[PDB]
Design an enzyme around this catalytic site. Sequence first.
Site, PDB file in Angstrom:
ATOM      1  N   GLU D  59       0.816  -1.206   0.000  1.00  0.00           N
ATOM      2  CA  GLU D  59       0.000   0.000   0.000  1.00  0.00           C
ATOM      3  C   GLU D  59       0.850   1.257   0.000  1.00  0.00           C
ATOM      4  O   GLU D  59       0.401   2.313  -0.458  1.00  0.00           O
ATOM      5  CB  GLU D  59      -0.916  -0.007   1.216  1.00  0.00           C
ATOM      6  N   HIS D  60       2.071   1.169   0.516  1.00  0.00           N
ATOM      7  CA  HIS D  60       2.965   2.317   0.510  1.00  0.00           C
ATOM      8  C   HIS D  60       3.654   2.460  -0.836  1.00  0.00           C
ATOM      9  O   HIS D  60       3.564   3.508  -1.485  1.00  0.00           O
ATOM     10  CB  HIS D  60       3.988   2.157   1.623  1.00  0.00           C
ATOM     11  N   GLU D 136       4.712   3.082  12.436  1.00  0.00           N
ATOM     12  CA  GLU D 136       3.255   3.121  12.472  1.00  0.00           C
ATOM     13  C   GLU D 136       2.710   2.194  13.541  1.00  0.00           C
ATOM     14  O   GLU D 136       1.743   2.531  14.233  1.00  0.00           O
ATOM     15  CB  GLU D 136       2.682   2.735  11.119  1.00  0.00           C
TER      16      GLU D 136
END
Lengths: 98, 411, 32, 444
Positions: D59-60, D136
């Site tokens: 996703e990054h 995160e």
Amino acid sequence: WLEGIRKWYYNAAGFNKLGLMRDDTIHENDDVKEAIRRLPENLYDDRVFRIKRALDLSMRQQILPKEQWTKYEEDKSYLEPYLKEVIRERKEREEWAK
Amino acid sequence: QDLEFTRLPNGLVIASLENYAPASRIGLFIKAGSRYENSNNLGTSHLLRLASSLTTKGASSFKITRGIEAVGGKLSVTSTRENMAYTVECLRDDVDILMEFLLNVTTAPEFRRWEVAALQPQLRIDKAVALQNPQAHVIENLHAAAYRNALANSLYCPDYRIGKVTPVELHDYVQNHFTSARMALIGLGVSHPVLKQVAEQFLNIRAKAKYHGGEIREQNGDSLVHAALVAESAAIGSAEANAFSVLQHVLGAGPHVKRGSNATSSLYQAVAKGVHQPFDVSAFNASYSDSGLFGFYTISQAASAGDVIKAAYNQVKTIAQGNLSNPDVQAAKNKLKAGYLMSVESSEGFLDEVGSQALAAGSYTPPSTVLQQIDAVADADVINAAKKFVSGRKSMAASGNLGHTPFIDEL
Amino acid sequence: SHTDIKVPDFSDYRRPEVLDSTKSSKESSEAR
Amino acid sequence: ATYAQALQSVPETQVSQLDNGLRVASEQSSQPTCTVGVWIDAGSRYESEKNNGAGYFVEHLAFKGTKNRPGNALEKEVESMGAHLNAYSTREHTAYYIKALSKDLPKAVELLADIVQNCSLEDSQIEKERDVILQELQENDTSMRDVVFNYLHATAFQGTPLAQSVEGPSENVRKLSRADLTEYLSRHYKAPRMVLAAAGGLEHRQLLDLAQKHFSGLSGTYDEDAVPTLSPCRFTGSQICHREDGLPLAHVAIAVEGPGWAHPDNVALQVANAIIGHYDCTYGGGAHLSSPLASIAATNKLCQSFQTFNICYADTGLLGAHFVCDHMSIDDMMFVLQGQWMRLCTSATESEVLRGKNLLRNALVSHLDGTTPVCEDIGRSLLTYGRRIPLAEWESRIAEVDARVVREVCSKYFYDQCPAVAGFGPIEQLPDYNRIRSGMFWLR
């Protein structure tokens, strides 16, 4: 005549002889406490004294002079305007469930 | 369909756009925000945001709450320093109910004192919740510095007024501002003459933001420094103000990509050239009927903010000197054209744009014309815009560990 | 972290009807 | 011009399919804006313990360079157009999408190819985002809400993929490779399992000409056993109690096994949850609210917040509630919460069911306001249900609900079942599972 009869019953009851008003005597109840809580401080703090004085009399088993007794025409219904409001709110809660 | 619009001889406005949506939406906007509060009756408007769903002459607080939920409708309040807003949602087969509840809140509330007193400590909650988000400290402490009296007022009640707001102040505030001249009734998925029927039947009834500048410094225990630096602006509706709105996006007013490096944000890049430690920055652009504010909002560490703010200050500074190209400006236009249209995409965000104009203008501005106003902006105005920021007197505000934070004069 | 948290094996104690991770327990709950 | 007649005038949804198996759909509207994106049948459920976090790790890097738009060049075109770009991932599904203007469609579609297709996955960036994601997790260690559900799935769905997180353990985040991802991408991202869909001021036919232009190149095929399939997962009745007295509040989450997406009784349950509703300490209704749970909670201040969720997975799900409360107030909540469930399983009135139905109507309508959530509803519904359901049909399914339906369905899935329980914080007062389980029935 009935007005004269209402008046005699009032003096017969005798909570004028302890300086109380009518609404000072009503049965402590859920619909009532709600109404009492909504009172203002002036009117409330007067209610407390009318009571605490009266209890101090019944302890001594005494009363006040006629000059301080509560008069029938002066019997203020200070609590009914707020109480009839509360009971109206209750019937809506019941009616809403039905 | 097309947006109906009119005005009543008593100064009241109506619009309508039968969107054929299943769910209606109605909103009664007004010019009764927090700027209309004096020093005496502060916290009033914060109580009003919560004073909805209380007793009225038309109904009781219990009837309102359940009567809405029985049809699954909704009731929500939004406020600004200028405007307030009472809004509903429902199904279009259920419009007439929500109106009768809506107006009884607005038109004729009783504000019986005991209900009010049971509501006061809710202020301490709604305030302190929203102040978890540290921006709300900064922005509120910021307007307290830039401006003196009117727009410097906080939306949120200060701590000393808790349990001191009377119903007397409210009814006064009601009668003093809830007038037909200041209102704007709006309804979507609804026909026009209905709102005419409602308004004629029911709603037919009867300070300056002086800039000063200054600085606030709220030293707290937090590793991150939240800070802002702004200058006086142009009011909304001015083409001058559109230049700031363009200048806002040239600098970068937040990411368009998720986790993107904000490649086009001149600020975030300019800071990145100097700093190599986690940071954030973006353009701040507040506008109001009387005035506005513009600048940038800062987030940095305790021992690096003094570098971040100067870098942002210099990037704006170079642009004011003349360092600005058309395609950079053209890009910000494409952003601004998008930011507007994407805001009014929903029924809700549309609804805020309709009546805001309606209170601030005698007619709705179609969005296509707004896009023309964007294209009308010249690059030089955007430069002269930046000159005002640098040359004009400043206002500043911060919060965090300010061990290394500068002042205005050092910038 | 919290994502590193994982449950250990109870299969020594689990009932034989529910030792297959790939099946829905509901079918024998009535019997269990 | 009634509610039903507005449902009638809803734009019908278009669908199609490419030769390579990819599905396409859209909804035309008079908006000037439009949202378009991709929705995949991929998540952590498909992941093993050794690739747990890959689908999140991608996703990054999907927005960090491609073969044709390397580095941040991709980001520059988005911001240049003023559009937005966004992503999310789930235990079942993953989606990238663009929010842009009606005219800017052919560039939006152009990127979503080059994103999915040609993600270069630069080794330098692989190591950067590796450090980011470990940062995160430390942040998500503080998001107490996300922790509970992650603990919750760990216990309900033990020994299965669903116990995993979207992000996976920090170990795999440290012990990952480019090779692990190319395996994950070359396996799961196939046209048949994917969906393009959109909404707003466009046309279906316009979308096809770009799909063939760009998405005709996808691998519409796969080896004899390359694409996995999903078996049912083992729900179980369990409890997890992460004690931490240092923290001032107590998050709780209890639930049971759910039907699944496609099971029709999902409709009735969304009502049942809606009868209970949801609450925070900012709602001004207080005592006068309808949900007797919310009424009591605002009165006695038993809590600061709660809600009702129904997470739906392929052939099962979670059904229950989340709530926050002071450590001296838990036992009161689990005695009233379970009471309302067993209240419904035994006796519920048409008025409150009707109250719940009117909520479910508005939620679906209000949730569908904007080009973005609409194409979300298109995307996942085409993956979960295979088709989309219009609001007319939802209303039709709602119409078949009454009190009798709710009593039965809740009795199937609440009454005398073995739930999953989770706690985090000063949960000392929390009733032990045999008391929780004791209250999942009545002696009436």
